[PDB]
Write a protein that binds this ligand. Structure first.
Ligand SMILES: Cc1cn([C@H]2C[C@H](O)[C@@H](COP(=O)(O)OP(=O)(O)O[C@H]3O[C@@H](C)[C@H](O)[C@@H](O)[C@H]3O)O2)c(=O)[nH]c1=O
Length: 303
């Protein structure tokens, strides 16, 4: 087996999130001997002029997605110049979402009592100066909302909105139509089960951004608060004028401080269109070979 060496350091997850995902895939789907040299805090993984792959274990080892098409270094894009996608991910997604008890088991395994008839929204982002306006919109809606919030950089402003004491793992609180719930940091695979379970997934960063695209449900992105509108140029292509406008107002507002209430309600006026659009994007994106295959076939043909 060929030898591959990856090294990630660290602003935190996302660097290890991408490297830990890629390292398992090159072992599992390509039978490679890879060692992830993490420099900072399912396996078989041993964790310029003119990713290290050649084997040398010397101490002084110096013994040797987002323009983007022109840079052929990392080479991770949305066009024919890709994304990390496990071979059986889409199949594992469909079997999970088509089994009613599997959906019930995972939710109940995380201490979540689903509000009957409620829209289920996962939110995982940085500090957004518009969280308060969005939660005011959900709380004032005439249909219930169940919000699942993993432990992270958003529970701070979440607490400042509810106004009570500090919130940690386990606390679940209701205001009007919105019921807020704080989740722990589970496993990467269970985070996929989370995305597959909710009707709307608010992600951020790099990997969860793509993981939610494979989830196939309506989603929202929070980029390290330039490259936002370049993502929407491809994402918005198929929708009608009313749905296109509602998706632009939704995503720009979450990143440029425009009213989260007006945008959210506008997008909800076109939910069947947005639901189908999210499914069609995942199927279109998955039609291209994944990144792990793109890294392997390139090395097999040398250069
Ligand atoms: C919420 C949650 C996330 N995760 C995973 C999702 C990914 O694997 C990883 C999250 O990383 P990302 O999705 O890329 O979001 P991120 O914000 O953590 O990553 C980003 O940080 C910013 C400062 C910069 O854009 C870069 O540094 C980028 O790495 O954590 C879990 O495994 N379990 C969880 O419960």
């Amino acid at each position: 087996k060929a030898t591959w060496d990856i090294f990630c350091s660290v602003d935190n997850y996302g660097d290890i999130g991408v490297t830990w995902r890629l390292a398992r895939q090159l072992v599992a789907e390509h039978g490679l001997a890879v060692r992830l040299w993490v420099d900072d805090l399912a396996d078989a993984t041993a964790a310029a002029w003119l990713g290290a792959f050649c084997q040398l274990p010397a101490a002084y080892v110096e013994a040797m997605p987002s323009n983007g098409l022109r840079k052929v270094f990392f080479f991770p894009g949305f066009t024919d110049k890709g994304l990390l996608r496990e071979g059986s991910l889409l199949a594992r997604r469909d079997g999970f979402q088509q089994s009613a008890e599997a959906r019930r088991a995972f939710l109940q395994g995380l201490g979540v009592d689903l509000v009957p008839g409620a829209l289920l929204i996962s939110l995982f982002a940085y500090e957004n100066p518009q969280l308060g306006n969005w939660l005011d919109a959900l709380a004032t809606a005439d249909q219930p909302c169940h919000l699942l919030v993993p432990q992270g950089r958003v529970v701070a402003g979440l607490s400042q909105w509810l106004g009570e004491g500090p919130l940690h793992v386990g606390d679940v609180r209701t205001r009007g139509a919105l019921t807020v719930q704080v989740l722990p940091f589970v496993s990467q695979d269970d985070f996929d089960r989370l995305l597959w379970s909710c009707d709307f997934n608010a992600v951020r960063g790099e990997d969860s951004f793509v993981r939610a695209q494979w989830a196939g449900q309506p989603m929202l992105w929070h980029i390290y608060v330039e490259k936002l509108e370049a993502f929407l140029a491809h994402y918005r292509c198929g929708l009608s004028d009313d749905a296109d406008a509602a998706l632009l107002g939704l995503w720009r507002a979450w990143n440029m401080d425009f009213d989260m209430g007006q945008a959210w309600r506008a997008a909800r006026q076109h939910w069947p269109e947005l639901q189908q659009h999210a499914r069609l994007w995942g199927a279109r994106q998955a039609a291209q070979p994944d990144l792990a295959t793109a890294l392997v076939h390139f090395y097999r043909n040398s250069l």
